[PDB]
Amino acid sequence: STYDSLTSSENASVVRSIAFFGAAVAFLSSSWGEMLVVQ
Amino acid sequence: STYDSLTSSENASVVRSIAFFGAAVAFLSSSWGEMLVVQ
Amino acid sequence: AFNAFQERRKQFGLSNPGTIETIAREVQRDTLLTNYMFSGLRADVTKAFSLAPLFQVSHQFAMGERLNPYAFAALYGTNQIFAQGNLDNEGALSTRFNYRWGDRTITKTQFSIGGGQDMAQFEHEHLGDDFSASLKAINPSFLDGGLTGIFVGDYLQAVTPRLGLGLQAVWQRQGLTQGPDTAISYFARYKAGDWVASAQLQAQGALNTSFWKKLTDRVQAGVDMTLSVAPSQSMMGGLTKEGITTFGAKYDFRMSTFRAQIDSKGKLSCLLEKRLGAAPVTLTFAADVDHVTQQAKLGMSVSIEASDVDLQEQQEGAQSLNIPF
Amino acid sequence: AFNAFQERRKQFGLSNPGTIETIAREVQRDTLLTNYMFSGLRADVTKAFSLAPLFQVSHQFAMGERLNPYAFAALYGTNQIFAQGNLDNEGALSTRFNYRWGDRTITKTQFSIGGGQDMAQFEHEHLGDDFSASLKAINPSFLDGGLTGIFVGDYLQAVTPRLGLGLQAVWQRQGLTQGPDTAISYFARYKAGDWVASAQLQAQGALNTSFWKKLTDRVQAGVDMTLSVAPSQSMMGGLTKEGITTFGAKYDFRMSTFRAQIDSKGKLSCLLEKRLGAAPVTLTFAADVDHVTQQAKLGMSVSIEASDVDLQEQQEGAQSLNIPF
Amino acid sequence: ALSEESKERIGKLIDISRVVVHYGYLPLILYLGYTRSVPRPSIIRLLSPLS
Amino acid sequence: ALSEESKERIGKLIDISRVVVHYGYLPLILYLGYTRSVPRPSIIRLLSPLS
Amino acid sequence: WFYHKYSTTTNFVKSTLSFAGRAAWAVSVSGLLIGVPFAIAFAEDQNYAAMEQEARMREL
Amino acid sequence: WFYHKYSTTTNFVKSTLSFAGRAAWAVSVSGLLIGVPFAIAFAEDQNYAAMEQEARMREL
Amino acid sequence: ALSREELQAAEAEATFTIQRAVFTAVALYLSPFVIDAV
Amino acid sequence: ALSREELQAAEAEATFTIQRAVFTAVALYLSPFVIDAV
Ligand SMILES: CCCCCCCCCCCC(=O)OC[C@H](COP(=O)(O)OCC[N+](C)(C)C)OC(=O)CCCCCCCCCCC
Ligand SMILES: C[C@@H]1CC[C@@]2(OC1)O[C@H]1C[C@H]3[C@@H]4CC=C5C[C@@H](OCCC(CO)CO)CC[C@]5(C)[C@H]4CC[C@]3(C)[C@H]1[C@@H]2C
Ligand SMILES: C[C@@H]1CC[C@@]2(OC1)O[C@H]1C[C@H]3[C@@H]4CC=C5C[C@@H](OCCC(CO)CO)CC[C@]5(C)[C@H]4CC[C@]3(C)[C@H]1[C@@H]2C
Ligand SMILES: C[C@@H]1CC[C@@]2(OC1)O[C@H]1C[C@H]3[C@@H]4CC=C5C[C@@H](OCCC(CO)CO)CC[C@]5(C)[C@H]4CC[C@]3(C)[C@H]1[C@@H]2C
Ligand SMILES: C[C@@H]1CC[C@@]2(OC1)O[C@H]1C[C@H]3[C@@H]4CC=C5C[C@@H](OCCC(CO)CO)CC[C@]5(C)[C@H]4CC[C@]3(C)[C@H]1[C@@H]2C
Ligand SMILES: C[C@@H]1CC[C@@]2(OC1)O[C@H]1C[C@H]3[C@@H]4CC=C5C[C@@H](OCCC(CO)CO)CC[C@]5(C)[C@H]4CC[C@]3(C)[C@H]1[C@@H]2C
Ligand SMILES: C[C@@H]1CC[C@@]2(OC1)O[C@H]1C[C@H]3[C@@H]4CC=C5C[C@@H](OCCC(CO)CO)CC[C@]5(C)[C@H]4CC[C@]3(C)[C@H]1[C@@H]2C
Ligand SMILES: C[C@@H]1CC[C@@]2(OC1)O[C@H]1C[C@H]3[C@@H]4CC=C5C[C@@H](OCCC(CO)CO)CC[C@]5(C)[C@H]4CC[C@]3(C)[C@H]1[C@@H]2C
Ligand SMILES: C[C@@H]1CC[C@@]2(OC1)O[C@H]1C[C@H]3[C@@H]4CC=C5C[C@@H](OCCC(CO)CO)CC[C@]5(C)[C@H]4CC[C@]3(C)[C@H]1[C@@H]2C
């Protein structure tokens, strides 16, 4: 179905960029985000 | 006389380079060379 | 009856959301490196002659791929006036002149003369108690027999103490030979106790999103994402699509500031600012590595700041000197 | 009867003058930046596993205009043997292997394989009590029915405890299709208590002169000058002439080393090595500015050196381990 | 309304004004700073930072 | 003296030798270092500096 | 078809091994780009923090 | 020939003033290239020398 | 170039969008009141 | 390419210069003795 079109050449950058943003938001907004803090 | 030829375009780099070396040797070997020393 | 509205407004906890231009300052101005990165050597010698009025002079030297080899800059500012000017090597003058009408409203102005393209840019900014409005005009002109130039109207409203909505309307015409061009961009901003998120639906369909979280007093991190679409790059209809997202963090130390950032295109960047003890010098090391091509851009800077000001002599006035930057 | 000669030589105060290749080491190796300058980022991670035998491994990363992006290197050395080898990113192997025959004579060797051009180079160096001799062969071959390749014979003699004279004869033929090519270069070197001067009248008529003076235990300065001539570049006979002279100084501090240099072509260079406290890291900052074109080249390097050696356990052996570098 | 006669005069006025600030702007800034800075610096320091 | 029969054989012998060192040289260095270094490092450290 | 099978595997290992080479290089430099400047800056911050705390102890 | 005299001076002042501009720029950066790294290095050397000298006094 | 009638049409839309912008801008300015009414 | 006779001439000089080099090399090796004799 659509999962073939999801990885098309044109949608490559957009879908990759969205996923990276999605991970970063969760990473910062979760207890894992504390890993960046050093003291 | 020859002093005109001394500054010819082709002899420019050579004569300029000799003078700079001549000054540097005197500068380092002279009492002025101590200027570089900081303590 | 305008008094009735105000007495109703005060019942809420609303507060100024800032300007549309600053709707993503935390991510795109404080943490990410996009604005501070550079290449080649650079040096900024500055001297401050006073603080009330604020008077300041500074020379900037640069080299390498940073081809612009010199720029003299002077800055004069006071409670009502702020005037500044850069004069680069080729004689091009870049200026700035903001005049304050009152506590909240100022009338910025920015000219660029000489060089590639002359430009003028006026804008009247009003930082209301619970909203920000700003009408801007770029290279305005009526001499062509009618209104001409780019006009921008910003607006940002606080709807609930956390959330702020606003839009930026545009209007432009490059000569009376053609019809005008108009666009609208919608903006939103949400600020919780420790994190701030904002979005921007721009004219071309491009969407920009950002997220900033303050992990601790010394550590911040934020991520921004840009999506865009262009018309039929395939030459056979359709629309091409692209996007990029960057993640970065800023660390504040006692005598240093460190920022790191990585794009979605494999480009990793780093910037370190160190202040040398009691002296006013502040080195700046900026490195940028692209992992796809394995090429690297490198830059170092040294900023000096002499001064002839007895700080406590004038700092008492500077603390309250509301220069209209 | 050769013993009679020795009993006469010992009467004088002569001593080894070094080698032709090192006749200007003080100026062109210790003080001037020519061999240490670089561009773009760089890093060298090294680890030492022992000192007797000396065993060592190191990786080198580089970027920017320093395009060579990686090079693994291993080093093994002992009283009799020293073997080393680099393996760059494209697989090209650069090696070295020196075997000591005795207290004074070592047969070096150096191969380059893969990459641009395959090359082999042998040389049998003898460091006598009052002279240095060396016969070198580059890409030697007899398979063309006759001797072929490049052969170099060095020789440097002490005539009086301060002055050293010597010459470097060459002989080469690139295939039996043509006659051989030969040349001779004359060398001189004078050393006083505090300064050293050396000249090199090379084959092509080019002349190289140098001067090194040790101002104090921590400060040195030297100047070298090069003159050269090429055949009738005007296309109407005659000879074209050119030359360049550089002046540089090196400052040794407790935890740093600083070198500066200026050419005769208006090119100013600088190199700062700083070692970070007790840790083994050492930062190297190299900048280069050409005032004629106002362009600048910048480079930063970080060298790390871990180790699994109890220094006092093996240092006593290292101080006496005469590795034939 | 606009007319050709007015257009040429106003057009050059902007050009005259454009060149006036292009040269005389920074000199105006330095004049303001030197005249009314809290201490009036000796004129030598003005354009010689980090002497 | 040289002959066509001898030249071809010696020519490839060098070529065989050239490839032998091109690959096996560094492994020979690491072998010597790992085998007879004063302390024998744990093989993990050998090619993982600054672990 | 012995050669055809041989070529495929050699191409596979050449690809992944080359990929492993680039991945390892990228990680190592990216560690140095952030590792070296950060450790230098961070080391100073700890040094000042200990010193000021030590100063308080002397005052107390 | 009023214009010819005027042109020569304008070309002269432009040439020398431009030359004065380049010379001033070259001196300023050349001072920064050597001045900044050297002063940073030299400052530390003095700091260590005073510290070790101070250490000797305390040991005495 | 463009025809006279089309120029009027283009300007007709351009004012409309700006007219649309202000209408929305006023809506936001009045928005907090309705939120309080919830 | 070069003619046979010229090749011999080129090699004749090449050996001479190398022969010249060694003769000079021995001269330097013997030079310290004459300096002492002054
Ligand atoms: C591929 C992997 C590559 C990795 C590369 C890593 C590189 C890391 C570099 C970190 C640099 C850093 O911050 O150092 C900065 C260091 C000093 O800092 P420090 O030693 O802490 O100071 C002292 C710390 N005390 C107090 C603990 C002792 O100044 C330098 O070096 C010199 C900087 C010279 C700047 C010259 C500017 C010239 C301007 C000219 C205008 C025309
Ligand atoms: C989870 C962590 C955060 C995110 C992240 O790390 C892990 O995830 C990694 C995935 C990486 C991408 C993977 C694939 C490629 C394709 C390559 O080739 C394009 C075709 C042509 C060139 O156009 C060459 O054939 C270009 C590079 C790119 C886009 C990578 C970029 C960096 C990325 C985004 C990295 C990013 C830092
Ligand atoms: C006493 C101190 C030591 C010596 C020294 O400082 C003072 O004296 C300075 C004189 C400088 C040169 C003057 C004239 C030029 C011509 C210019 O233009 C050529 C034509 C074209 C390029 O070919 C461009 O138009 C090229 C540069 C050059 C050669 C200067 C080089 C630097 C020099 C050698 C300086 C050197 C460091
Ligand atoms: C902190 C970060 C964690 C994530 C990350 O490190 C640091 O992990 C690395 C893995 C890397 C990829 C590995 C393999 C290749 C193959 C080849 O693809 C282009 C074809 C080439 C010709 O063959 C063009 O020259 C080279 C590039 C690519 C895609 C790398 C891209 C950068 C990547 C994504 C790096 C990424 C930034
Ligand atoms: C996998 C990808 C490759 C790039 C990367 O991840 C993604 O690889 C990670 C390695 C990290 C460093 C590891 C060790 C240290 C030492 C520490 O020294 C204080 C020690 C102690 C003193 O009391 C207090 O911790 C300071 C921090 C530093 C330099 C790390 C910095 C971030 C780095 C460079 C990370 C970088 C983003
Ligand atoms: C993944 C990779 C693993 C290797 C690596 O990360 C990346 O691991 C990190 C450890 C770092 C060092 C830790 C400590 C300090 C001490 C400080 O000393 C001045 C302060 C002074 C006050 O008293 C005390 O020294 C100077 C900096 C230095 C030497 C660091 C340099 C960079 C290093 C070597 C990094 C290295 C690149
Ligand atoms: C420590 C050092 C002491 C000496 C030194 O500073 C620092 O003193 C500076 C004076 C400089 C020159 C002044 C004027 C010009 C005119 C113009 O000549 C090329 C024509 C141009 C087109 O007009 C090409 O673009 C530009 C270059 C040149 C010759 C300068 C060269 C560098 C010089 C020699 C500098 C030199 C290094
Ligand atoms: C004319 C050409 C232009 C370039 C140049 O000449 C040639 O201009 C010179 C200016 C010099 C600096 C002047 C002042 C200082 C301050 C001092 O700070 C410790 C002060 C005190 C602490 O107790 C002990 O003195 C350190 C040295 C430094 C930076 C000089 C460095 C060399 C410089 C850069 C010279 C450089 C070669
Ligand atoms: C011709 C030009 C005129 C201007 C100029 O020369 C050339 O004049 C020089 C003065 C220099 C500074 C003097 C002192 C120090 C103190 C030291 O502090 C860490 C040590 C710490 C130990 O306790 C105490 O601070 C860091 C370096 C710094 C700030 C110098 C930076 C470069 C400067 C600004 C130079 C500048 C370029």
Q: Does B26 touch chain D (CB under 8 A)?
A: no
Query: Phi then psi for F24, rounded to 5 degrees?
Result: -85, -5
Inter-chain residue contact C70 with H40, CB threshold 8 Å: no
Residue C144 contacts A where some CB pair is shorter than 8 Å: no
Compute φ and ψ for D292, nearest 5 degrees. -65, -45
Atom of ligand 1 nearest to the CA of C62: 42
Distance B18 CA to ligand 7 centre (A): 19
Q: Is C50 exposed, middle or buried (0-12, 13-18, 19+ CB in 10 A)?
A: buried
> H27 to chain C: nearest residue by CA?
C61
Amino acid identity, residue C283?
L
- Atom index in ligand 7 nearest the CA of residue H31 equals 1
CB pairs under 8 A between D and H: 41
Is G44 in contact with C253 (Cβ distance < 8 A)? yes
In short, whether G12's Cβ falls inside 6 Å of ligand 4 is no
List residues of chain G with CB under 8 Å from any CB of chain D.
25, 28-29, 32-33, 36, 40
DSSP states of C264-305 as a string? TTSEEEEEEEEE-TTSS-EEEEEEEEETTTTEEEEEEEEEEE
> For chain H, where are the alpha helices, taking DSSP H only?
2-59
Task: Please give, one letter per residue, the 3-state secondary structure of C152-187.
Answer: EEEEEEEEECCEEEEEEEEEEECCCCCCCEEEEEEE
Strand partners, C323: none
**Distance of alpha carbon B2 from alpha carbon A32, whole angstroms:** 82
Measured in angstroms, the CA of J35 and the nearest CA of chain D are apart by 8
CA atoms in the 13 A half-sphere facing the CB of C42: 22
Rg (CA), chain G: 25
**Are H and I neighbours with ≥3 CB pairs closer than 8 A?**
no
Q: Which residues of D touch J (CB under 8 A)?
A: 8-9, 11-12, 14, 130-131, 153, 155, 157-160, 165-167, 169, 171, 177-184
Q: Is D323 on the interface with B (CB under 8 A)?
A: no
Q: Which residues contact J24 (CB under 8 A, 6 or more apart)?
A: D167
Tell me, yes or no, if B22 comes closer than 8 A to chain D by beta carbon.
no
Size of chain H in residues: 60
Residues G37, C289: C-beta atoms closer than 8 Å? no
**Tokens of residue E42, six digits:** 């000796």
DSSP C244-269: EEEEEEEEE-SSEEEEEEE-TTSEEE
Residue H39 in contact with ligand 1 by CB distance below 6 A = no
Q: Side-chain half-sphere of D279: how many Cα atoms within 13 Å?
A: 13
Number of H helices, E strands in chain J: 1, 0
Distance from the Cα of D245 to chain B's closest Cα (Å) equals 6
Q: J3 by DSSP, 3-state: which? A: coil
G and H in touch (3+ CB pairs within 8 angstroms): no
- Which residues, other chains included, contact C207 with Cβ-Cβ below 8 Å and sequence gap of 6+? C199, C200, C201, C226, C227, C228
Do residues F26 and D93 make contact, with C-beta atoms less than 8 angstroms apart? yes
Give resolution, Å, one decimal: 3.3
- Tell the residue number behind the tokens 């140098």, with chain if given: D210
Ligand nearest H24 Cα, by number?
7
Q: How many CB atoms lie within 10 A of CB B27?
A: 16
The residues of C whose Cβ lies within 8 A of any Cβ of I are 8-9, 11-12, 14, 130-131, 153, 155, 157-160, 165-167, 169, 171, 177-184
Q: Do D245 and B20 touch (CB under 8 A)?
A: yes
Atom of ligand 9 nearest to the CA of C277: 25
Residues 6+ apart with CB under 8 A from D10: none
Half-sphere exposure of A12 (CA within 13 A, CB side): 4
Chain I residues near residue C157 by CB distance under 8 angstroms: 25, 28-29, 31-32
Residue G45 structure tokens? 């911050």
Q: SS3 string of chain D?
A: CHHHHHHHHCCCCCCCCCCHHHCCHHHHHHHCCCCCCCCEEEEEEEEEEEECCEEEEEEEEECCCCCCCEEEEEEEECCCEEEEEEEECCCCEEEEEEEECCCCEEEEEEEEECCCCCEEEEEEEEECCCEEEEEEEEEEECCCCCCEEEEEEEEEEEEECCEEEEEEEEEEECCCCCCCEEEEEEEEEEECCCEEEEEEECCCCCEEEEEEEEEECCEEEEEEEEEEEEECCCCCCCEEEEEEEEEEEEEEECCEEEEEEECCCCEEEEEEEEECCCCCCEEEEEEEEECCCCEEEEEEEEEEEEECCCHHHHHHHHCCCCCCC
Which tokens sit at D63?
A: 């970027």
Determine whether the shortest distance from the Cβ of G60 to ligand 6 is under 6 A.
no
Residue with tokens 């308080």: G56
For chain C, give every domain's residue range: 1-325
Neighboring chain G residues of C294 at a CB cutoff of 8 Å: 25
Structure tokens at D301: 């390097």
Chains H and C touch (3+ CB pairs under 8 A): yes
H41 to D291: CB separation less than 8 angstroms, yes or no: no
Token pair 């300064």 is at which residue? Answer: D195
- Partner-chain contact C294 D64, CB within 8 Å: no
SS3 content of chain F, % helix, strand, coil (to 5): 75, 0, 25
Asked if residue C265 has its Cβ within 6 Å of ligand 4, the reply is: no
